[PDB]
Ligand binder design. Structure first.
Ligand SMILES: [Zn+2]
Lengths: 187, 159, 104, 53, 75
RNA sequence: GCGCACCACCGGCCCGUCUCGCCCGCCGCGCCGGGGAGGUGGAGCACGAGCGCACGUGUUAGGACCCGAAAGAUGGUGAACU
RNA sequence: GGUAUAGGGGCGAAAGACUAAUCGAACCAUCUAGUAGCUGGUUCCCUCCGAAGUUUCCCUCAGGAUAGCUGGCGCUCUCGCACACGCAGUUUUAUCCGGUAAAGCGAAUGAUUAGAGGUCUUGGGGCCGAAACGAUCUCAACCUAUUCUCAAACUUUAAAUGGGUAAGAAGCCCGGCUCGCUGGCGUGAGCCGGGCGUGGAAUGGAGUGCCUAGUGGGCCACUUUUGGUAAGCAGAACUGGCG
RNA sequence: UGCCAGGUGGGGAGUUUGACUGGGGCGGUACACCUGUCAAACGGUAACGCAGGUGUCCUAAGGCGAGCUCAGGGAGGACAGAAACCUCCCGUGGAGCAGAAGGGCAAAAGCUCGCUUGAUCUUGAUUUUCAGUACGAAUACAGACCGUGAAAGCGGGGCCUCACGAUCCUUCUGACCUUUUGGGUUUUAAGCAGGAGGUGUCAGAAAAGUUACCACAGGGAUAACUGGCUUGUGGCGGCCAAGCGUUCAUAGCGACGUCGCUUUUUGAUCCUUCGAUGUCGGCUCUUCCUAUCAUUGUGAAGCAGAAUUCACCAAGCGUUGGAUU
RNA sequence: GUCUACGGCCAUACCACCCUGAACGCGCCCGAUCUCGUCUGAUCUCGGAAGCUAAGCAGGGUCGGGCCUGGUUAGUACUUGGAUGGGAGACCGCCUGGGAAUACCGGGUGCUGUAGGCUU
């Protein structure tokens, strides 16, 4: 006879990756041991990000990684990205880097190796710095997907700039009553 | 069903009190308001332009915009699912300064004074307010005169 | 309602306040060659009877009178429609009523 | 009935499309037949180019 | 076949099931709803804030030097 | 202290539109073209995240979870009863 | 017995009668698995969470859409890893809001009883009078001090309950810049640099983004209350239950 | 005769014949809006609840600046009287502000004057039903042209709360506006922006009846039976006592008031039943109730006998034959 | 002690009657040429300083009316929450907290800001 609301007693956070691939599970075991032994929170963050789904770890662009490493203070530090590193074609000068990532695109890998940089996997990063010392943790833009453009306040509402679900943009598919001031109203 | 009129049910709210009709006093006109000032809204029947809605009567909000002779104020209104902070434009006569924040500001100044003081002395002074404590047990002196006996009054039909 | 035939008001082309001649607005002919009229005729032609709905549920008994104001100053002559609230009695220059007189 | 921000679409399945559904289970057989016909024509025109004029 | 017209019996319980909250207060609120002349003046001031940056930097350096001298005198 | 991702805000940029205004170019000097500042509208830019396949749920068009009408149309057969 | 009239047709001394046990539109096949907001049914186990009959719109009222109630997927952070920010059907401290209960009508408006002083003022019946405010009362509306009873659409007053706020770092104290706004100097706002931390009680880990089934017939009970004589009647407000 | 055009054309064909509703129909609009109450002192809140109002009107009844105070009452002055005109005083608004009501207003927001059309044009922001979407209405601003006053200032309609309308189509206005398709010119047409023509079932179908010849999918959400709560009404019984009763309230009655009982009448509700509970009477038959017509036993009188009504225990036994319907 | 000009709170300031005002000041008051507007210099405007506290105004008084603030009314009316409390009901009582308003009886009858005067 106790009044406790069991509505949110079960936490929905992930515990193991849903992927059935074996290399990711081996990395999960390694970082589980590292997080439960070492006092560093870097291992815990890396394990949590490894648990995340594909959409929750967007790819990181080479230009974004370059601009994040160019910040003063993180000189000679290894970049740790749980997603994938993708080449950026609109950048010419690429300094040498120390990048740790699950995957790297072929073009980005060629660019980094030609620039004189070094690319490491997560097991190599664990062997080098078990507690993640001298590491810069980076991630891609979470809201970069076009899916989030359709989220938020619904269209046809004042002060809303949400992209509606339209079969094909055009003159006679929208921008009519509800959007034109000359036809009914607008928001 | 009831009508959705703006001034429906405001027979007594938007009405001046007894022996206080006539010309509006000029202190309300000649008192200033700044941004972020806590102000309680009270409608006035004499002035109709810029009159706030009946739902905002008695509600208190902060000032965010000040026009020539009106004030933009954000107030919290609860409508059946949630509380929304919404901004309304209210003329000067329908607005008053709130002393609730002034009472807290005075206590803040007292705390600053009492922290500047008693610091070089080293004696830490109690700054936090405390609820009503026990009544600090004391002695009651019955000097000579004994306590007065109270006999219940017998019933009698008066009316 | 009563309105004067002259009204000094804002002019879009001139940009300043100038006098305007005031007239009441009336509907013109359909000219028989509008796109909607042509579509209506081509749809009504042939068999099938009446295609478009016919409004037979009139309720109100007045129209919003529209004032056409023509700029008096030459070289502009800019017309502009001005709307007024509903009224079932409209006139221009109609007997300004001579406030302070007798009634017989 | 629309439900919480779905795309407005108009499927063109109001006719008797099931009677006029055209399957493609004969695609590999058709490819084999075309290949055989092409080889037969090439063997017919022995010194002439396979592609043609 | 008359039905019930209107009631709000369970509405309070429905509201409080999710725990209705006050609106999210965030610092640096939006400037929507401010008079256009004031907005223009603030925009001009922000645009011209870059003017006289060296004077502000020199004044800050002088203030830092004064504070350093004061703390050296204190110690 | 450098400050990922993300939120709030301030600025900046692109296109449509309004207002005030001053100058630029020429193969054709004109009912030419270009540029500024200040508001506003856009599903926009602001160092990217999409494409293909598979699975799950929800919404529809189709027979459409299964069975159910009173009706309508097309073409044929009945005066062996009446 | 033969023959002629075949289905929106035939035929009918007329009953909507007959037309192969069917006739207010015969029978067979096809469109056709026609449509149904309406009935009925909807197949194994365990575990966890777990509702609504409410908002507004619809020729809407046995139904949908939209919010609400609900589930799932997560994500961003704090930490019993001797070292905590924020949030609340709570209370307390100060500040405002109300016009209901109550009370009043010797105070405004409306109703209303009865006596005293009033040719206040006029008028009707009357009696003493040709009449007379000359004496006598009376009934009519009014007054001067009183008196009896009232008001959901009255109120000078006026609670209990209740509704917004503030109880600090997103705050104070200085120094300097910008302003095409405002001004005599000044404002006011925005920019940068520096100094000061437990800001009433008690309990809670919080915030955020999407996919989203079902529900949109309710009923009962303490208290308040509308119509009705009353109703296991109809219709409302808070809370709690059945559902 | 062949083809167009106009008229006639339930002979024939297709279809429609709103919604709420203490069943439906009839009656009304509670269908779009506004005022006070309902409404329980934030707000919001139902009924075919109560009292009402609206689909107008205004070139002034809008906007300024100035001057006066209104309704009413008293005292006075030739015609002149209760009401014509003039003067003095009192006069918190008891007048007026267009309407229905509420709020509000006194060197006004009222009346009279003088000038005027801020009832003009254009971006946005916000408020009321809100889903926090439109429409309508409204509030602070801003950018131009203005009106008025000496000026501060006020005014982009009416002192505030109501007076109104989506898509499509048509019509008018505006740009030295765009396209009109291979290029060029001109009519025409299609475009952008701002008004109007209207959907009163007022978030907006184009819409007459009957069926007793009827049909189908459903509903006891919804009626006509019974039975359920209540007893207004019907029937029956008490309490007080002004009087009727020749005298005398209570032998028998009983006004003005008031308290109850019954479901053997009609009412109200729709709780059970619309995949069916056979819908009035009469005949036959059994049982039960007393609110007792008569019989048994008694109390009472305006009970001399007879006759008689009033009351008590009391349902054991009886409560008939016919004309009409 | 007090007056004028501009005010703030708007009756403790208002209303009725009586008494007193030394000086400045506020006004009454004298005229219509000029400015100004009316049927009338009545109001307003203008040009003045022969008379006055007569009046306004200021101060005081009324066992004054009213107004403001207290006691009484009264822990009464009412009211949050509670009970397997009473009663046939209408209603009432108790526990737990808050707490009114008339009649009736006391006190008071404007404070104050800026600038400029008089009693030097
Ligand atoms: Zn012009």
């Amino acid at each position: 006879g106790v009044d406790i609301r069991h509505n949110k007693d079960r936490k929905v956070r992930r515990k193991e990756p849903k992927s059935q691939d074996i290399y990711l599970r081996l990395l999960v075991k390694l970082y589980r041991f590292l997080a439960r032994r070492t006092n560093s929170t870097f291992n815990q963050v890396v394990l949590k990000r490894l648990f995340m789904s594909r959409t929750n770890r967007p790819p990181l662009s080479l230009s974004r990684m370059i601009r994040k490493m160019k910040l003063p203070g993180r000189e000679g530090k290894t970049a740790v990205v749980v997603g994938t590193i993708t080449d950026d074609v609109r950048v010419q000068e690429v300094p040498k880097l120390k990048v740790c990532a699950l995957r790297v695109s072929s073009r980005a890998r060629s660019r980094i190796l030609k620039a004189g940089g070094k690319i490491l996997t997560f097991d190599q990063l664990a062997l080098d710095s078990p507690k993640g010392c001298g590491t810069v943790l980076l991630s891609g833009p979470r809201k970069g997907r076009e899916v989030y453009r359709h989220f938020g306040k619904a269209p046809g509402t004042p002060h809303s700039h949400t992209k509606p679900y339209v079969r094909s943009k055009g003159r006679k598919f929208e921008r009519a009553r509800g959007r034109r001031a000359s036809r009914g109203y607008k928001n | 069903t009831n009508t959705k009129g703006k001034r429906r049910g405001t027979r007594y709210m938007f009405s001046r009190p007894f022996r206080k009709h006539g010309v509006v006093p000029l202190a309300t006109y000649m008192r200033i308001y700044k941004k972020g000032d806590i102000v309680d809204i009270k409608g006035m029947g004499t002035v109709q332009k810029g009159m706030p809605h009946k739902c905002y009567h008695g509600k208190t909000g902060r000032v965010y915009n000040v026009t020539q002779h009106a004030v933009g104020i954000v107030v919290n209104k609860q409508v059946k699912g949630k509380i929304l902070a919404k901004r309304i434009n209210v003329r000067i006569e329908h607005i008053k300064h709130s002393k609730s924040r002034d009472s807290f500001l005075k206590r803040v100044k007292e705390n600053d004074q009492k922290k500047k003081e008693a610091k070089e002395k080293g004696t830490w002074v109690q700054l936090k307010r405390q609820p009503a404590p026990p009544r600090e047990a004391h002695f009651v002196r019955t000097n000579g005169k004994e306590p007065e006996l109270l006999e219940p009054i017998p019933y009698e039909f008066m009316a | 309602v009563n309105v004067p035939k002259t009204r000094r008001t804002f002019c879009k082309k001139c940009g300043k306040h100038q006098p305007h001649k005031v007239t009441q607005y009336k509907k013109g002919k359909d000219s028989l060659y509008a796109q909607g009229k042509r579509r209506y005729d081509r749809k009504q032609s042939g068999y099938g009877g009446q295609t478009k709905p016919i409004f037979r549920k009139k309720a109100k008994t007045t129209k919003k009178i529209v004032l056409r104001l023509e700029c008096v100053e030459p070289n502009c002559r800019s017309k502009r429609m001005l709307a007024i609230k509903r009224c079932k009695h409209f006139e221009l220059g109609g007997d300004k009523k001579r406030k302070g007189q007798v009634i017989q | 009935a629309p439900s919480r921000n779905g795309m407005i679409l108009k499927p063109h399945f109001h006719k008797d499309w099931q009677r006029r559904v055209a399957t493609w289970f004969n695609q590999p057989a058709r490819k084999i037949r075309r290949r055989k016909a092409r080889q037969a024509r090439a063997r017919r025109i022995a010194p002439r180019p396979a592609s043609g004029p | 076949a008359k039905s019930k017209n209107h009631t709000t019996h369970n509405q309070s319980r429905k509201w409080h099931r999710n725990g209705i909250k006050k609106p999210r207060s965030q610092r640096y609120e939006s400037l929507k709803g401010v008079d256009p002349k004031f907005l223009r003046n603030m925009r001009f001031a922000k645009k011209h804030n870059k003017k006289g940056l060296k004077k502000m930097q020199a004044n800050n350096a002088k203030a830092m030097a004064a504070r350093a001298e004061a703390i050296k005198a204190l110690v």
